């Protein structure tokens, strides 16, 4: 039912956006079909974890506060696709960075990123035109999108001096995860589920924000270890954190427990595309028992998650039920 309802609202959102271009923006059929294919390519195929989370939060809050049910569930589906379209926008922007007479494919890629972001505003201005939360929804959405761009600046420039392993600390790693990932992947779906369910001021946002940062931290730590050790055919992609000199959990943890001579070996091999220098870094990670510390670190984080949900259910019982389902997905 939830996935089937989420996909029906996608067709409704897509048909409005394309017809709006056809009727109000003077677009020709060739470009409408071009944008339909681009929308399907960039927005569909994922797991829709962010979008479905908005639905799960909405349905749990109407079970513990007829016509208001069908409207709130539909409003949550539009908000779910706002995040999915926003994620598709971030992914297109990421493809432009590593992808490199005007090059029309780069022009269309940049244009795709602008259209995907603008579509989040257009679908919200339309389906929520008569909603009292439309102003507050756009402001929290824009602020979280701004947060993500700030986190990308932290992540991209973690190895230099913005006109270098000094910022390779655990607190800066959390700052990167918090702004670059946790806010729009974990906090934003929960907030949007509260907004459409009219139960925004009924929750302790401090514990809600704290759980979102902790769950995003738990997910990013596991994602860092898999990027290094999980082979490509099982991970689904090629792990490239070592070559790209990313501020990963493995890097900042290794630097705290490595000897002075091992740090020199790590610095001399980190951030290189050479096959042996990457293997030398993986060897240093192995010999430091980092995958042993990974299990304990996630266990301690999981305990903080398993216990912070209880603070949230004392005043918001139904809200904590969906947060548990979101944590179980992680």
Ligand X SMILES: Brc1ccccc1Oc1cccnn1
Q: Which stretch binds ligand X (CB under 6 A): 18-26, 44-52, 61-69, 227-235?
A: 44-52
Q: Which does 53 bind (CB under 5 to 8 A by kind): ligand X, Na ion, a copy of itself, none?
A: ligand X
Which residues lie below 8 Å from residue 86, measured CB to CB, with a gap of 6+? 116, 117, 120, 141, 145, 184
Question: Is the Cβ–Cβ distance between 130 and 74 less than 8 Å?
Answer: no
Told to check if 53 binds ligand X by CB under 6 A, we report yes
Q: What is the CA radius of gyration of the chain?
A: 22
**Helix, strand or coil, per DSSP, at residue 168:** coil
- In this complex, which beta carbon is closest to ligand X, that of residue 10 or of residue 219? 219
The first and second tokens of residue 110, run together, are 């940049």
Q: Which does 238 bind (CB under 5 to 8 A by kind): Na ion, a copy of itself, ligand X, none?
A: none
Spatial separation of the C-alpha atoms in residues 133 and 314, rounded to whole Å:
26
Which parts of 99-161 fold into alpha helices (H)?
104-127, 134-156
Residues 23-82 that bind Na ion (CB under 5 A): 49-50
Q: Which does 64 bind (CB under 5 to 8 A by kind): Na ion, a copy of itself, ligand X, none?
A: none
CB of 144 to ligand X, least distance (A): 13
- In this complex, which beta carbon is closest to a copy of itself, that of residue 10 or of residue 154? 154
Spatial separation of the C-alpha atoms in residues 144 and 119, rounded to whole Å:
16
Question: Is the Cβ–Cβ distance between 241 and 225 less than 8 Å?
Answer: no
Spatial separation of the C-alpha atoms in residues 68 and 48, rounded to whole Å:
24
Q: Binding residue per annotation — 155?
A: yes
Spatial separation of the C-alpha atoms in residues 287 and 265, rounded to whole Å:
13
Residues 239-258 that bind a copy of itself (CB under 8 A): 243-244
Residues that bind ligand X (CB under 6 A): 47, 49-50, 53, 185-186, 219, 326, 329-330
Query: Which residues are annotated binding-site positions for Mg(2+)?
Result: 94-95, 98, 155, 223, 227, 241
Residues that bind a copy of itself (CB under 8 A): 21, 25-27, 30-31, 34, 93, 96-98, 100-104, 106-108, 110-111, 114-115, 118-119, 121-122, 125, 134-135, 138-139, 142-143, 145-147, 149-150, 152-154, 156-157, 160-163, 175, 179, 243-244, 273
């Amino acid at each position: 039912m939830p996935m089937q309802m989420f996909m029906q609202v996608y067709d409704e959102i897509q048909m409005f956006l394309l017809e709006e271009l056809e009727l109000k923006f003077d677009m020709d059929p060739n470009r409408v079909r071009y944008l339909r294919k681009m929308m399907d390519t960039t927005c569909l195929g994922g797991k829709y974890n962010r979008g479905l989370t908005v639905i799960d939060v909405a349905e749990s809050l109407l079970s513990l506060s007829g016509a208001r049910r069908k409207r709130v569930l539909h409003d949550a589906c539009v908000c779910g696709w706002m995040i999915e379209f926003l994620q598709a926008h971030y992914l297109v922007e990421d493809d432009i960075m590593d992808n490199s007479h005007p090059d029309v494919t780069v022009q269309c890629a940049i244009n795709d990123g602008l259209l995907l972001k603008s579509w989040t505003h257009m679908m919200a201005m339309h389906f929520f035109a008569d909603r009292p939360f439309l102003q507050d929804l756009l402001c929290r959405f824009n602020r979280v999108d701004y947060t993500t761009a700030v986190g990308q600046l932290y992540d991209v420039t973690s190895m230099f001096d913005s006109n270098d392993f000094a910022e390779f600390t655990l607190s800066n790693y959390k700052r990167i995860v918090k702004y670059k990932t946790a806010y729009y992947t974990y906090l934003l779906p929960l907030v949007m589920g509260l907004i459409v369910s009219e139960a925004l001021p009924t929750v302790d946002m401090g514990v809600t924000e704290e759980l979102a940062m902790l769950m995003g931290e738990y997910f990013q730590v596991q994602d860092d270890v898999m990027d290094c050790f999980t082979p490509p055919e099982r991970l689904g992609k090629v792990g490239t954190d070592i070559q790209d000199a990313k501020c990963s959990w493995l890097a900042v943890t290794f630097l705290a427990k490595a000897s002075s001579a091992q740090v020199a070996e790590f610095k001399a091999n980190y951030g290189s595309g050479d096959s042996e220098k990457v293997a030398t870094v993986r060897r240093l990670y192995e010999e430091a028992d980092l995958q042993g510390d990974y299990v304990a670190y996630e266990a301690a984080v999981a305990e903080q998650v398993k216990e912070l949900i209880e603070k949230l259910r004392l005043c918001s019982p139904g809200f904590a039920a969906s947060v548990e389902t979101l944590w179980g997905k992680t």
